[PDB]
Amino acid sequence: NEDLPISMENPYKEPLKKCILCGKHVDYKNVQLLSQFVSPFTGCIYGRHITGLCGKKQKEITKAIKRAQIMGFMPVTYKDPAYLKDPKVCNIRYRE
Amino acid sequence: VESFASMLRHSPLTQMGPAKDKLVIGRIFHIVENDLYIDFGGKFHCVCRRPEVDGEKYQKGTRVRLRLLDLELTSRFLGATTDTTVLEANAVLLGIQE
Amino acid sequence: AGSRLETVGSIFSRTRDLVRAGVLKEKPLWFDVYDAFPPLREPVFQRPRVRYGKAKAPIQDIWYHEDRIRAKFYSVYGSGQRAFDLFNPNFKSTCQRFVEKYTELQKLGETDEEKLFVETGKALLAEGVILRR
Amino acid sequence: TKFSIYPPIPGEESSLRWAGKKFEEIPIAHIKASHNNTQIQVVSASNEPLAFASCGTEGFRNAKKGTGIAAQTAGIAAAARAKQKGVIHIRVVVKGLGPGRLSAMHGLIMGGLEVISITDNTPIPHNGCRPRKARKL
Amino acid sequence: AKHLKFIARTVMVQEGNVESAYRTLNRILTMDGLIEDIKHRRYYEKPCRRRQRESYERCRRIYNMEMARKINFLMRKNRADPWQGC
RNA sequence: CCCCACUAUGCUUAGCCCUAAACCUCAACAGUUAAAUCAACAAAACUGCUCGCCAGAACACUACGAGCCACAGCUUAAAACUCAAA
Numbered sequence A: 001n002e003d004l005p006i007s008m009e010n011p012y013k014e015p016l017k018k019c020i021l022c023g024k025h026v027d028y029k030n031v032q033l034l035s036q037f038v039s040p041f042t043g044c045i046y047g048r049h050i051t052g053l054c055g056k057k058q059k060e061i062t063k064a065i066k067r068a069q070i071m072g073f074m075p076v077t078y079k080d081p082a083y084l085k086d087p088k089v090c091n092i093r094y095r096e
Numbered sequence B: 001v002e003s004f005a006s007m008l009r010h011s012p013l014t015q016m017g018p019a020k021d022k023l024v025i026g027r028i029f030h031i032v033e034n035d036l037y038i039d040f041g042g043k044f045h046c047v048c049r050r051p052e053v054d055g056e057k058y059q060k061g062t063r064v065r066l067r068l069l070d071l072e073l074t075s076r077f078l079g080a081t082t083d084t085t086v087l088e089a090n091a092v093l094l095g096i097q098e
Numbered sequence C: 001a002g003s004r005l006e007t008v009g010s011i012f013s014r015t016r017d018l019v020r021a022g023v024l025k026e027k028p029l030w031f032d033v034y035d036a037f038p039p040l041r042e043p044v045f046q047r048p049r050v051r052y053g054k055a056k057a058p059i060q061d062i063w064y065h066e067d068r069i070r071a072k073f074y075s076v077y078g079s080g081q082r083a084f085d086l087f088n089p090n091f092k093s094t095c096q097r098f099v100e101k102y103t104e105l106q107k108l109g110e111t112d113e114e115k116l117f118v119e120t121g122k123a124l125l126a127e128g129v130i131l132r133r
Numbered sequence D: 001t002k003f004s005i006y007p008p009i010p011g012e013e014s015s016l017r018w019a020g021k022k023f024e025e026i027p028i029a030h031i032k033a034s035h036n037n038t039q040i041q042v043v044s045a046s047n048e049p050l051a052f053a054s055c056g057t058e059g060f061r062n063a064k065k066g067t068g069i070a071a072q073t074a075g076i077a078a079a080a081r082a083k084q085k086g087v088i089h090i091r092v093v094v095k096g097l098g099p100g101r102l103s104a105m106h107g108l109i110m111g112g113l114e115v116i117s118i119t120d121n122t123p124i125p126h127n128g129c130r131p132r133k134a135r136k137l
Numbered sequence E: 001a002k003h004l005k006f007i008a009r010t011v012m013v014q015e016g017n018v019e020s021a022y023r024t025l026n027r028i029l030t031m032d033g034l035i036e037d038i039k040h041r042r043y044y045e046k047p048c049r050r051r052q053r054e055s056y057e058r059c060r061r062i063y064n065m066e067m068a069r070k071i072n073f074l075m076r077k078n079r080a081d082p083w084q085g086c
Numbered sequence F: 001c002c003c004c005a006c007u008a009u010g011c012u013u014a015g016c017c018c019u020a021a022a023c024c025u026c027a028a029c030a031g032u033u034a035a036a037u038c039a040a041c042a043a044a045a046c047u048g049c050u051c052g053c054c055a056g057a058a059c060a061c062u063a064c065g066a067g068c069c070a071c072a073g074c075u076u077a078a079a080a081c082u083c084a085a086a
């Protein structure tokens, strides 16, 4: 009989979801990108429940932010005002 | 003599593939106030709210267009060894089948 | 009256044993019918088990060759604007027409999936069915 | 023009003005709201102390000193002494989470000064010194 | 101390609405965790107590999320009875 | 217990001391999920193999001996009297 099902991997398998930064290089010198994941008012680094990043890229962003802050590329206690008008990628609203 | 394997292979439900975001025709078979129970040929019916636009046309036997999301709504919860089912399909009511 | 130990044996074995032992004076009405036409499995109680380790359910996923084609279709031409009618036992979707034409082109021609895809699309458009990518 | 909740940047030229002066020229009201006292000092943009008033300098003593009414009185008096020096607009900078954090600002507004911006400067160490042990009450 | 002033934790007032600006500042300081940090730093929290507290809060959040998901999933069945009488 | 002040100590360097609810209170490797699942609770139930340890309570994280940079210390660790329980 030819009608029997055949062993096979799911062809309808949807691709696994990817974070916004997947495949992209995160550099401590790219302060513009790093500033998109810190609080505008306190400079505190957002958690992954806000940034939506995967664990690997969350760690990469955290390390890059600390490196840039200590090496004299990024402010610590606030987000640099030059980057306040960049696209908002974090799921947080201060009702400001 | 057609075997069960051939029936399953050439069945429309088998041919449809994944049920997510598929347009189907359903038939209203029961109405409870503003809740319409619709069969679209699956194991379970789907229950939809009567639209506010031309709501009077939705009567028993009426043919409607649905966008399927799930053939059956199930989910496993904390501390359970088996899924919990509501015995209902998930669908979006689009309109009447002209 | 018979034993109420529903987890020991089955109703048939219990009734047969008690009839043989003299506890039951007469066989119940269903005993002869059961004995002449038994079920495929004797209804003995069993406690269902949770599986662990490498033990896996032996149920296989149902896949057919044309599913691959269907997948490509639903990713390229998207879900057909025409709606499915599952009540019709012989309903034929646009994807099913594409699958049939693909299989015919495969059987009357060569085996290169991409060429089969484009040839099938051309043939269906020639037939006169709209297929927006 | 959409109101910007963020302050102007001293570098970037902006059009916001208050009595013809820029943001970086307005006097600053530094409020220190401790747990038992509230101290308000008005200084210029060039750090010239204009007025100073706390809950202690206004006669309140001991536990009455760390109250909202005491902070309101201190704010009113600081606003008066600053009004006697040509201050109408101020930028507020609060430090501490004491009871008079808002009452002192209320007093400053009620004394005649206009508040254009609020800033928080409460000290938050990123784990510097070790605090004292919790009370066994 | 070494940073530029009047940028961090600074709110502008709109049309003299001082109270709205102050409440927005309170909202920001609470959402960024600074209020909780200041309140927790008044006295020293022992490392073991800190670890226990964080574990408890994480597990409580997870459990509450799961319970909320369960109730939201079972709220679909909550409607008018369709087979009244039988 | 609350408030204030201030030591040994918490730190660095070089040596000691060798103790913890040093706990996942689960010994290491390999395998199984079929059985009757299974005293109970903890943390689903077991199998093969190896090492370590345990044979009523208390006396006893004790005495003596031995070893130790330790000298009010650590490791190892009893017996007599007593009880019908623990």
Ligand code: FES
Residues within 6 Å of the ligand: A017, A018, A019, A021, A022, A023, A053, A054, A055, A056, A057
């Ligand atoms: S999802 Fe791939 S790097 Fe984040």
Ligand SMILES: [Mg+2]
Residues within 6 Å of the ligand: none
């Ligand atoms: Mg000292």
Ligand SMILES: [Mg+2]
Residues within 6 Å of the ligand: F023
């Ligand atoms: Mg433990």
Ligand SMILES: [Mg+2]
Residues within 6 Å of the ligand: F027, F028
């Ligand atoms: Mg070992």
Ligand SMILES: [Mg+2]
Residues within 6 Å of the ligand: F061
């Ligand atoms: Mg000891």
Ligand SMILES: [Mg+2]
Residues within 6 Å of the ligand: none
């Ligand atoms: Mg000795």
Ligand SMILES: [Mg+2]
Residues within 6 Å of the ligand: none
């Ligand atoms: Mg000893």
